[PDB]
Symmetry: C2
Subunit: 89 residues, 2 copies
Amino acid sequence: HMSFFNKIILIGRLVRDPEERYTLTPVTTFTIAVDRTTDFFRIVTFGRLAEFARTYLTKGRLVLVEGEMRMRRKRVSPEVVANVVRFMD
Amino acid sequence: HMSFFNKIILIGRLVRDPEERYTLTPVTTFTIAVDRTTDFFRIVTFGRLAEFARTYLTKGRLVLVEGEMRMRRKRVSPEVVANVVRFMD
């Protein structure tokens, strides 16, 4: 329950290699190019998905990303907290 | 065809009344509160949907928004170009 919903699904290329970035643990970020001019999206992954991201994802590679569109303030910064990342190619 | 994909689906309240804003024609914008802290999203509508938006949408009202997440630069500004807006309440 809640009464709200936030879902984003993107398919794009990785335009550069993922950054592994362990918190407190594992966080991997990468930005994908989702062309329509292009839209660029910062993707964030956590835990095993962060782990999967860093040890398998590389630039150019085409991925599906499923997650939430975070509008994080305070100066509003848009990131996708991914719950799913699959290779497409 | 293309090889890319960009889909966003949000359900949130309108936190203020829509702005009708005719181009060249009809464009209506509004921002929804999609709480998880909240994420705020600028929604853009065009044509009959802009028309529908302005003449039917008001603050507080809970809507589904389906569309695309635009990352428009150049200083990157996130808007949802909606293809669908339904009342939920």
